[PDB]
Amino acid sequence: LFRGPVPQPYEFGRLVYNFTKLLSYFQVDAFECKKVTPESIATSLTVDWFAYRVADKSDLLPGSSSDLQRFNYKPTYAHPTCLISAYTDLSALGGSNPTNYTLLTNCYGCVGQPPKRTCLEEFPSFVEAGYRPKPSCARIGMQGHASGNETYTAVVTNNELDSVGDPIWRMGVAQTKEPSVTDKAELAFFVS
Amino acid sequence: LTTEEKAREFLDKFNSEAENWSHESALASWDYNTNINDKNAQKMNEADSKWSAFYKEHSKLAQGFPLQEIQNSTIKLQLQILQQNGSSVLTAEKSKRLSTILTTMSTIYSTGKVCNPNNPQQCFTLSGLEDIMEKSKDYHQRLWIWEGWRSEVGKQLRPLYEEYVALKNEMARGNNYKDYGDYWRGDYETEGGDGYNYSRNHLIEDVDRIFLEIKPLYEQLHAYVRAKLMNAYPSRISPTGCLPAHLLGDMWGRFWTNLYNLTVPFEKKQNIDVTDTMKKQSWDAEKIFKEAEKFYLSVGLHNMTPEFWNNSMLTEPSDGRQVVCHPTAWDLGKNDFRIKMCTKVTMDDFLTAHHEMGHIQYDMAYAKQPYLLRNGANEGFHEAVGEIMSLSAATPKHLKDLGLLAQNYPEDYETEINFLLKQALNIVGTLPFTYMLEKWRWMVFEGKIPKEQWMEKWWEMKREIVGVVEPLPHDETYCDPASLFHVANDYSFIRYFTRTILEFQFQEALCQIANHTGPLHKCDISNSTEAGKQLKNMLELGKSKPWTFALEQIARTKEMDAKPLLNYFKPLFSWLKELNGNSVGWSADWSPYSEQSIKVRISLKSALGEKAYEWNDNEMYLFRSSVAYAMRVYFLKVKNETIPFRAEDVWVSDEKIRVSFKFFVTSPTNVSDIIPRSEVEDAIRMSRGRINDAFRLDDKTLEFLGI
Ligand SMILES: *[C@@H]1O[C@H](CO)[C@@H](O[C@@H]2O[C@H](CO)[C@@H](O[C@@H]3O[C@H](CO)[C@@H](O)[C@H](O)[C@@H]3O)[C@H](O)[C@H]2NC(C)=O)[C@H](O)[C@H]1NC(C)=O
Ligand SMILES: *[C@@H]1O[C@H](CO)[C@@H](O[C@@H]2O[C@H](CO)[C@@H](O[C@@H]3O[C@H](CO)[C@@H](O)[C@H](O)[C@@H]3O)[C@H](O)[C@H]2NC(C)=O)[C@H](O)[C@H]1NC(C)=O
Ligand SMILES: *[C@@H]1O[C@H](CO[C@@H]2O[C@@H](C)[C@@H](O)[C@@H](O)[C@@H]2O)[C@@H](O[C@@H]2O[C@H](CO)[C@@H](O)[C@H](O)[C@H]2NC(C)=O)[C@H](O)[C@H]1NC(C)=O
Ligand SMILES: *[C@@H]1O[C@H](CO[C@@H]2O[C@@H](C)[C@@H](O)[C@@H](O)[C@@H]2O)[C@@H](O[C@@H]2O[C@H](CO)[C@@H](O)[C@H](O)[C@H]2NC(C)=O)[C@H](O)[C@H]1NC(C)=O
Ligand SMILES: *[C@@H]1O[C@H](CO)[C@@H](O[C@@H]2O[C@H](CO)[C@@H](O)[C@H](O)[C@H]2NC(C)=O)[C@H](O)[C@H]1NC(C)=O
Ligand SMILES: *[C@@H]1O[C@H](CO)[C@@H](O[C@@H]2O[C@H](CO)[C@@H](O)[C@H](O)[C@H]2NC(C)=O)[C@H](O)[C@H]1NC(C)=O
Ligand SMILES: *[C@@H]1O[C@H](CO)[C@@H](O[C@@H]2O[C@H](CO)[C@@H](O)[C@H](O)[C@H]2NC(C)=O)[C@H](O)[C@H]1NC(C)=O
Ligand SMILES: *[C@@H]1O[C@H](CO)[C@@H](O)[C@H](O)[C@H]1NC(C)=O
Ligand SMILES: *[C@@H]1O[C@H](CO)[C@@H](O)[C@H](O)[C@H]1NC(C)=O
Ligand SMILES: *[C@@H]1O[C@H](CO)[C@@H](O)[C@H](O)[C@H]1NC(C)=O
Ligand SMILES: *[C@@H]1O[C@H](CO)[C@@H](O)[C@H](O)[C@H]1NC(C)=O
Ligand SMILES: [Zn+2]
């Protein structure tokens, strides 16, 4: 969990212990659980994680209507789960710290092929709880992150074909934000 | 006792007996419909006679309880229902005459035939003509059918409709209404405190307001359809004009459903059809109704009674009995509910089963009300409730849960557009039709449109409101509105307008409660007991409360609102808008026959002075005869052809009080064949001298524009 670049909300990591020991690498800003108490966690284990901002921790909470849980990542809470939002310097642990944070703010379908392709905001593409965003939505976030553009808009296709063999197009917007904590990696973890 | 107390006892006794008598009538009618023969027909007629005699006696008795002395709104409302006089305000001669006219108009409509103008032995009844209009893509065939019906039937009803209007207005006045239009609008009238009152005049303001809100959507659909029809019928349709009346998918242009095969957005994609799966999984009529029952149970509504499952007719009899399969929901009284349907294992009957059971659910909900109040809040409430249940059941979401659609079945945005377009053709494309038709009838009954301008205003309104233009000019011997079932048979029509608007208000309100996210057309209220409760609270009221109250209980509003409809079709609107660009809208100047018409202006005063005559109908007849003559001479001498042109082959339009009109000529044996303007102008010059003498006019007082 401490190696390589930190995954973004639209490409979150998935990996399937001493609970206290793990909570000694990060400074915790917020902590909450659902259908469980942290004492029981300590006394399969699945960890999902991604880069996020601690300033925006209010969006990680259940009941949120924020973009994060609409287009990027949403928990199912089918099983006992705890939410951790914390920060650390990953470089000293064999990893690397992010320079900015990127999330999808919109994604929606398009009908027809070029030059007659028409994109409709009325057909939103939401992420299913417990699942990753569509390959064509994920593509937008990736290009957005690496574009050097605070607001990035694009129409892409990513090996998604329909029933007649035609490309499936999707349009969306990615937003890039600055770090809130100086010289630290800000991460969100969902542990179930 | 006081008047109110006496009225109380009167109604209690009436309602008890009314239930008993109504039940016997309902049973006799049922037996006939599920077993058609002479014995059952006789029993049915006898049972109805007894009911009518009962009701009439108590109606007269109800006149002894003045409404001014009643403070209890439940009692007052029931007395108002019983105290209606109706036709009884007329004298015996007028009452008998009106009944005769209504019977006559119905008979003429149902037995009308149109014969192929080029094959006298090939005649079709209305059912045959409708079957052709729904499928034919032949411009000519569609035209002689359209015109034939209007000429063969419409011209028989004209004089009957004129007498009909006069008699119905006298009746309405006898019942203290301004006119018969005012009489019909009383069906939406309510009284009460707060904002729960609704005057008859308010209905007019609301339909006009709603129409204007809808219009921007209709214009986008209209432009789209026009662009497609221009390919189906090359050089027949103008890109900036109205659509020809005979090319709209049916005999009247009421629905645009049958244009789908020409207008479908994405022709490589198909709509969802689970018929094959139902057959593969061995579904039958019983299973279909059992699944409909589960749907309603999931939202906290009733199961069907033990009797329902035994007494109902869910499939067509195989025992020789003759029945009428047309699907209906019955409430026979005394907690006896039934459905009469001939169910097939198809997706269409699957959805129909949900529709019909929705009616039963509503009937059960208000079964606790007094007999006279066991109805919907308005005439459009029952249908609106049924339709929303069909919308929910038809979603891909619901079909997957039922196992009728593959769980991994992918989403396709092009398919969703095809779906919305098909829906718009039936739901949106009909609203301007309903609006325009009622507006015309209201003005006719009121007296805003005089007899001399009935057809003039009919077609003027069609071009301005709907965007449809007649293939041929019609004078005042025609009665086009009477060629429609509902007009000929004395039915109100506005119910279809209001039903549609309410339907979407109910659907949106229920989807918000169910916490639906995303497009409204993908909403499914299954397993939502909160949505179910909100609905049940409205359904059980029957008609004991103002419909504005009943509406508030579900949609949390006292007014009809077009926004829910516009929201439903929002994704379609955006797609059409981008595609249509700036080609949206139409003029009312162009018509199929205008390009080759000749304008004639005559001045009789400057020609003859004191000897000048009046340009009456007889002079117009002579003119048409003179033109036909000129056409015969031209063709015989120039083309060496003998063509029997008659005055009837000369069409005249846009006639003013002053002597100014336009005309064109068609072939005697072809109505889609308009003689080229250049050939007509040549004929006029050749015989110009004879035309001149006929009217004692020179070449300055008889002007043919273009010559
Ligand atoms: C957020 O941080 C990322 C780094 O993780 C920044 O990505 C970098 O953006 C610059 C453009 O501003 C990229 O340089 C360009 O590369 C292309 C392709 O080689 C070249 O054609 C251009 O001329 C230019 O050199 C840079 O390569 C990219 N870094 C990586 C690893 O891809 C991103 O800009 C930051 N976002 C914001 C809003 O600051
Ligand atoms: C309304 O709510 C009920 C209850 O939750 C839903 O019924 C359920 O349907 C699901 C499948 O849609 C059932 O799960 C699956 O059942 C199949 C057998 O048909 C099995 O092979 C799978 O492994 C899986 O177990 C679920 O058990 C069932 N729940 C019951 C019957 O209590 C219903 O589908 C919902 N309807 C709508 C429109 O949402
Ligand atoms: C429908 O949703 C409301 C509100 O839920 C929140 O807002 C939604 C739009 C969505 O973003 C949800 O994920 C949010 O959680 C529910 O109202 C809540 O009900 C619970 C009881 O179960 C109550 O404790 C909360 O206080 C309510 N919240 C508010 C703002 O009133 C409502 O129950 C949902 N309806 C159904 C049938 O589940
Ligand atoms: C309904 O009409 C009656 C008069 O018509 C008679 O009674 C009907 C029930 C029916 O049987 C007709 O064929 C009969 O000719 C109205 O009763 C009269 O009302 C006026 C007041 O406007 C009063 O002066 C008369 O004396 C009443 N006559 C009788 C016999 O009662 C009755 O008021 C009308 N009701 C409504 C709602 O219009
Ligand atoms: C629209 O096209 C469909 C085909 O996609 C027509 O439906 C077919 O009609 C023929 C003749 O009755 C039947 O033999 C086929 O089995 C039908 N096919 C299907 C899938 O139903 C439909 O009739 C056309 N409608 C109009 C108005 O032309
Ligand atoms: C309900 O009744 C009130 C009267 O109490 C109606 O209000 C009148 O409406 C007319 C037409 O707009 C106005 O000219 C009057 O000045 C209004 N009077 C008052 C006191 O406001 C109201 O319109 C009725 N509601 C409906 C739907 O008919
Ligand atoms: C009546 O006149 C029309 C012309 O308005 C004839 O239409 C033609 O139909 C044939 C098909 O058999 C087409 O190839 C021609 O191009 C059409 N003409 C035009 C101008 O479109 C129609 O055939 C005539 N009907 C008869 C004689 O029964
Ligand atoms: C890049 O940023 C500019 C503003 O500086 C914006 O106009 C442009 O649309 C952005 N590019 C993309 C693909 O969004
Ligand atoms: C009206 O009368 C009914 C009985 O017929 C009674 O149940 C109801 O409460 C009364 N309502 C009012 C306002 O008096
Ligand atoms: C539906 O029918 C079942 C079986 O008879 C019954 O137990 C259940 O209570 C009924 N539903 C309701 C709401 O009464
Ligand atoms: C169905 O109705 C018939 C006619 O009344 C009756 O004889 C029969 O027993 C009923 N069957 C059931 C299950 O109620
Ligand atoms: Zn119905």
Residue numbers in the entry:
A (entry chain B): 389 to 404, 410 to 436, 441 to 589
B (entry chain A): 20 to 726
The authors write:
Indeed, RBM insertion 1 accounts for two-thirds of the difference in buried surface area between the two structures. Integrating these findings with our mutagenesis data provides a molecular framework to understand the identified determinants of host receptor species tropism. However, the restrictive effect of this glycan is less pronounced on MOW15–22/PnNL2018B S1 binding to P.nat ACE2, underscoring possible differences in interactions with different ACE2s. Despite the restriction on viral recognition imposed by the hACE2 N432 glycan, the two viruses could nevertheless utilize P.nat ACE2 harboring the C432N (glycan knockin) mutation, as demonstrated by observed viral propagation and S1 subunit binding. The phenotype indicates that these viruses can overcome the steric tropism barrier imposed by the N432 glycan, possibly through compensatory interactions in other ACE2 regions. However, a recent study reported that PnNL2180B (PN-βCoV) primarily exhibits intestinal tropism in its natural bat host, suggesting a potential fecal-oral route used by these viruses in bats.
